[PDB]
Amino acid sequence: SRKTYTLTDYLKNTYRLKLYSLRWISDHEYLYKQENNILVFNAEYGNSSVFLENSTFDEFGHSINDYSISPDGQFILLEYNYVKQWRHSYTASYDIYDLNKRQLITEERIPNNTQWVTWSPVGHKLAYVWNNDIYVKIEPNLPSYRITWTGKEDIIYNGITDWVYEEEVFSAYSALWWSPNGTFLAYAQFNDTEVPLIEYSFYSDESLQYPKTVRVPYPKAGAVNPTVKFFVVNTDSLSSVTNATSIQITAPASMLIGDHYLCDVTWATQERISLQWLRRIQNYSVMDICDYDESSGRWNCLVARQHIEMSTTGWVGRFRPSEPHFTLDGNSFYKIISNEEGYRHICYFQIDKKDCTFITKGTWEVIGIEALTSDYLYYISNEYKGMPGGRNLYKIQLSDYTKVTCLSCELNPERCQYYSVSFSKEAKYYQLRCSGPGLPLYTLHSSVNDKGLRVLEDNSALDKMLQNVQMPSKKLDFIILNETKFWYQMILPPHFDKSKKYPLLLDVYAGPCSQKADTVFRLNWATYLASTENIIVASFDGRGSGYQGDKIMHAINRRLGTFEVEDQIEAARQFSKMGFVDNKRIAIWGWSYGGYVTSMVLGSGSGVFKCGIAVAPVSRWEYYDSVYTERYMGLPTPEDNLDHYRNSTVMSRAENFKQVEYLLIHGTADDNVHFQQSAQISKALVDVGVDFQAMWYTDEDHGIASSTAHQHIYTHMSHFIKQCFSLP
Amino acid sequence: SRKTYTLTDYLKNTYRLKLYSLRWISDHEYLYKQENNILVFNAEYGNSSVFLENSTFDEFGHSINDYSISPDGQFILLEYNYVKQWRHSYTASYDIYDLNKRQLITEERIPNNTQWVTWSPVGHKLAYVWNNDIYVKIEPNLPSYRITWTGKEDIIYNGITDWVYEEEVFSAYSALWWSPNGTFLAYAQFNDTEVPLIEYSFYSDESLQYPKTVRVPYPKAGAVNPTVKFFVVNTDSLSSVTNATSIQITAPASMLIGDHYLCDVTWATQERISLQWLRRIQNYSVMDICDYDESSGRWNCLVARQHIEMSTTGWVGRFRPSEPHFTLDGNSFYKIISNEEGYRHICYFQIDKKDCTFITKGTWEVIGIEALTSDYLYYISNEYKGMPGGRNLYKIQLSDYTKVTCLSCELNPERCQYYSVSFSKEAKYYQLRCSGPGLPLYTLHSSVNDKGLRVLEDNSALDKMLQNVQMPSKKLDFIILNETKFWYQMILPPHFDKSKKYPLLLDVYAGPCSQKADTVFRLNWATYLASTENIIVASFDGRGSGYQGDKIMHAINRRLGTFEVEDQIEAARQFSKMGFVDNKRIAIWGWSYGGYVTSMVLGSGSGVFKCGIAVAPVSRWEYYDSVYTERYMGLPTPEDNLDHYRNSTVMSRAENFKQVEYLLIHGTADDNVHFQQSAQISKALVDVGVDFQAMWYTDEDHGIASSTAHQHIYTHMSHFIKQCFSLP
Numbered sequence A, B: 001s002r003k004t005y006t007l008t009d010y011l012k013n014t015y016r017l018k019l020y021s022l023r024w025i026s027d028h029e030y031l032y033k034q035e036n037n038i039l040v041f042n043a044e045y046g047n048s049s050v051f052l053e054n055s056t057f058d059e060f061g062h063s064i065n066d067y068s069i070s071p072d073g074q075f076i077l078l079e080y081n082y083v084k085q086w087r088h089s090y091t092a093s094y095d096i097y098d099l100n101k102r103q104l105i106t107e108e109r110i111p112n113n114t115q116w117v118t119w120s121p122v123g124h125k126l127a128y129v130w131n132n133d134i135y136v137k138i139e140p141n142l143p144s145y146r147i148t149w150t151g152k153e154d155i156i157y158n159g160i161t162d163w164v165y166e167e168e169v170f171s172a173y174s175a176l177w178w179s180p181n182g183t184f185l186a187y188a189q190f191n192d193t194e195v196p197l198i199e200y201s202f203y204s205d206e207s208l209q210y211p212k213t214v215r216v217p218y219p220k221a222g223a224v225n226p227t228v229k230f231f232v233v234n235t236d237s238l239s240s241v242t243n244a245t246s247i248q249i250t251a252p253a254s255m256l257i258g259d260h261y262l263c264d265v266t267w268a269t270q271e272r273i274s275l276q277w278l279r280r281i282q283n284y285s286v287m288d289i290c291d292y293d294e295s296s297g298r299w300n301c302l303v304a305r306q307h308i309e310m311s312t313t314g315w316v317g318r319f320r321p322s323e324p325h326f327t328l329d330g331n332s333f334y335k336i337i338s339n340e341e342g343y344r345h346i347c348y349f350q351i352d353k354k355d356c357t358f359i360t361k362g363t364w365e366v367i368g369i370e371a372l373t374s375d376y377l378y379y380i381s382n383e384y385k386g387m388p389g390g391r392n393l394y395k396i397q398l399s400d401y402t403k404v405t406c407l408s409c410e411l412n413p414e415r416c417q418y419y420s421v422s423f424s425k426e427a428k429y430y431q432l433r434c435s436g437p438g439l440p441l442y443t444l445h446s447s448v449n450d451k452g453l454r455v456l457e458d459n460s461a462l463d464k465m466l467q468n469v470q471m472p473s474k475k476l477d478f479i480i481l482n483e484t485k486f487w488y489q490m491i492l493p494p495h496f497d498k499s500k501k502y503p504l505l506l507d508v509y510a511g512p513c514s515q516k517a518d519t520v521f522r523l524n525w526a527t528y529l530a531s532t533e534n535i536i537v538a539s540f541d542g543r544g545s546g547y548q549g550d551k552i553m554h555a556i557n558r559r560l561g562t563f564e565v566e567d568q569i570e571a572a573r574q575f576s577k578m579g580f581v582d583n584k585r586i587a588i589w590g591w592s593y594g595g596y597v598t599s600m601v602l603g604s605g606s607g608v609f610k611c612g613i614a615v616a617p618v619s620r621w622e623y624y625d626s627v628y629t630e631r632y633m634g635l636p637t638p639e640d641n642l643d644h645y646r647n648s649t650v651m652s653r654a655e656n657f658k659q660v661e662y663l664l665i666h667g668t669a670d671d672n673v674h675f676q677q678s679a680q681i682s683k684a685l686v687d688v689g690v691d692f693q694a695m696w697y698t699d700e701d702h703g704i705a706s707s708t709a710h711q712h713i714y715t716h717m718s719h720f721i722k723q724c725f726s727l728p
């Protein structure tokens, strides 16, 4: 009798999740924007003051995309004129508001088309990047010191990352790293001088008469990669007439025999930096600990102090080598490491010592180390009730590692099974965020005795609303394939009847270390397909999937487009044999790696799927970028892995598409997974006589995320699926 | 007749039309290729011998693409390694083989990657273009002589055309023209320096890691255009110590004031050249007659013998200034001109004398002048039976204009209402080539007494085959919109039943001077649609269409996307009325201009059409080239015609497509109508929320003509129509 969840509701964002985004600003206080005022909250007692009134800047003349306040909080930075580049990078203008006076600073402004800005971690110093060169303001109203002079568009980058680094390495435009004092500015330089350029058309506005070609240095598998150097400047000794002195830190000798990357930089103390590096064959990584010479002004990294990580089974880390979490003193650290059994767990390392100690063990994995005092290490794992799809917070007593307490497990156990966390400085207080399986819940807690303090957002407004809709439900369970347990979720229509036969949509991603079966609450496309269209949407984590150990995750090492594909069919097969899925109507769809897999499934000849959708798919691994692809596939040369690079393309199995119905979609401005990839699939289908559907989306990138293209793509896919399943 | 005309039949060519393609080599001899033998035929008597054995070049080594025999039969040119460029351009390697010995020449071979080669019209001289520069070989075994040194890729073209000139001005890669002596070589040189480029991606074979970017100089409407110069070289005064002297003929003072085109190049005598020039506003045109001053070595264009052509209702000529045909003495010419009633007729000009005299007149038009002798002028017209979609050969006694004989009207009045002709040298003989409405007939005749020498090919082999197919029939009629006859055509289902109600596909082109309603016999897609699917395919010639004089042809001037679009609709509306057309099931389709007209219709909100397909459609005239567009549209500036450039985009109609089902198709490497045109359509559709189906074809150009892509698009289109129409 109630309304169902409709496409419109999805697209028009009718039922909205309420969030609670806070920024810890000390051990006991946090920032929060409410009704557009910036507020400081006291964690302990719950009371708040207004940092910055909503009324301030209503005469400022520009609408403001973002802000960032001094640590030692006398300035606020205002970001405006935001122009997006890639996933993390962008260009903007900035003004600085002097909080003590009622004033914008007026002279020495941070320039326009600034590519990155950062406050120092204390005080109110500023580093910014402009035309690929680094600058430093000591005071906001003073002239900046130029640190580098080598910036050249698309060629040399100081303090920012190039495309592959932004995307595959640091998940960030930034390549600047302030000392904890603020004394030093560490920064990376990239040189893309010989990196080949992916070119593509942008058509933009109807009034542009000639298309623009966009040209992006983008190393595809086996191509010349960017090189990198690393520098540290002392920001306390800058002259106005002397060019600043940047000291180089050289990679270790065992990284210099060949192509390598900088994968991680962590400050350990005021005078010690941690630099992890990686070989290009991502087999082998080195952590260097560099100390600062008081007398010399130099940085030395003692060999007897390096830390090596290797794997014979696969690559180092889930996507990159893990991050070290240092003790206050900087003489030791804790870091996630795959154990002997293949399980990622926390290892305690001493800096001068060489082997490490495991602080956790067992048939589950650690997801992150979240805070560390002298007393306690806080982390997230999927230990609870043995569900890898699950996330919870844990507290180790460091005087005895067997005394672990779970902080989130039983706070709201039917409602909350997927937490993330946000500790204040010195882990005095934390916010918890349960992401599912019920409505998201944001709580505030005091570490002292782990007293719950206060609910922040409970989403009850959403709850009252969703009581009036025909919500689908979620089944999280496992099947068995060859002795091992693999998990799947199903999103099930309202009033699911196990005696009926429902159409089933396999929603696939299945990349190395992915997880599509989990406890989180989403309101999405699947929600609509289940509520209105009575379609079971199923998802399944097969070999190559993560959070369940190496045996499963490294199964796909050097062999993408293989066990992850077979296992999707094997599970679709099994869902078929269950007596509520009508095997005549099984479809499959995926975005991105999802598309590559959906296509590899459509082309397997399984005859299990009526039809499916591949959006922005990888079709051939030589088209994708070096850092991601080489991590799973090695190099595409005869001496290495050319054979399997060639064996695993969507085009190789074009004929088999004649048995299936296929919708193939790709935005033309995809800088990530290039249009070329869908353009080689479509050609291969044509070359063989296979009919299919296509959709390009002019000037859309990898996410096809403009308001219109979003509504349109999901509209297009609904029609393709309703009619695939003979639904009116 | 039981079996039907099948899509496979169309695609696979079960049923081919037989041809007869001859090249005359004198006033009584031609060559025909039968097998891979070149045979010579005596036109008067019918005897024939083998000129060239099919087995002459078995041990050549390379696949031979095409031949060309010198006008003194002494040597043959063999064309190999042919690589397409645009519609007429290509590069190939060439060999010259001696016929009087039996040996390939090996000294001084035509270079590889030769852009163009041609023989002198008499004898065995060669002119050729390599690397944008012109070379002259007096003898095939001898070193060539260099005429130009200014060649340069995509900037300077000598002897060959750039992109616009090839496609829009000359219909030819060639910008060279021998005088009949083979004494003088005349040639144009194009300068594209400031011509902006169209760039698109070309994906190529799989093995290519990074798409290539294609860059072609292409002036869109209003852009900077190529400049031209014209030169005449004396081919007989060449020395191999001295550099070649090229005499320049400059354009008339009234062309030099602004932007202008070189239109036409016609030698009149051994020592006299006709140049036609066209203003960038294409309503003024000047013909210059230019003579060799034996004494000075120069070329003088007297203004006494200059001729002006102006149009006040539209533009000049049909697609350009008509070509003149000079009488042997070089002192008079005949040339097609819009008469004062606005119909195109043969006009008689005397070189030094004013005006001209019209030698034909009426409510019909000369299609072309074909042959000129001492006593007669032969020409082709649509007079016969007031049928503008028909064509016959005609004869005018030069000594009394009123004495006009129809050569072809009555040869076979039922099989044949559509001729073209190929006259021997000195017009002693002609091959009549009948295209319809019955099967093509090919007959040879003699001019003396207009005797029918022999049937050359009667397509009897096809005739018998088709007796066994349930062939569709063609209806040619007309309707009256104001008090004007506009002609349409219908391809009608076999066993047509005027009391059943048939789905209608309206097959549009409808560009300026087009004719879609004629008597030509075709085996094509509509043939399949009619015979196998019992769909009626209708084409209609409304305003802007051709060969019915200027009131109709010029109705569309400065007005593209108005009247012609309106008229298609009104026409479908008229088809509605007739009780054999189901008005729930009317569709429209078209390619190039017809793709544009379709979209424009579709988005008009007429409600007449259920759906429609548009292939490589124009969407916005600013995106298309300058020569074609501005010819109809004027310039896209505010003072000229910007208002109608903006009032006539496909994009401005997007909201209306909600009402219809659209199919939009384009080749990614279309260099004529750029992918951009469709990329802009799809965006506007995305932006406004309209659903529609799409298909790009990667690396296909304008014709979408690789055999596999050809098959794929008709298959795709066939399904789309079949499901639009509720047809299984």
Ligand SMILES: *[C@@H]1O[C@H](CO)[C@@H](O)[C@H](O)[C@H]1NC(C)=O
Pocket: A035, A036, A037, A054, A055
């Ligand atoms: C500013 O905050 C106040 C405090 O609740 C609120 O009433 C008001 O709507 C806000 N003003 C604007 C313009 O956001």
Ligand SMILES: *[C@@H]1O[C@H](CO)[C@@H](O)[C@H](O)[C@H]1NC(C)=O
Pocket: A150, A156, A191, A192, A193, A194
């Ligand atoms: C960048 O690399 C190239 C060689 O790949 C080198 O020639 C150039 O000097 C380098 N530039 C800098 C400033 O590192």
Ligand SMILES: *[C@H]1O[C@H](CO)[C@@H](O)[C@H](O)[C@H]1NC(C)=O
Pocket: B040, B041, B042, B047, B048, B049
């Ligand atoms: C036709 O026959 C005549 C007389 O036998 C002969 O001389 C002539 O060369 C022949 N022409 C052809 C084309 O074979």
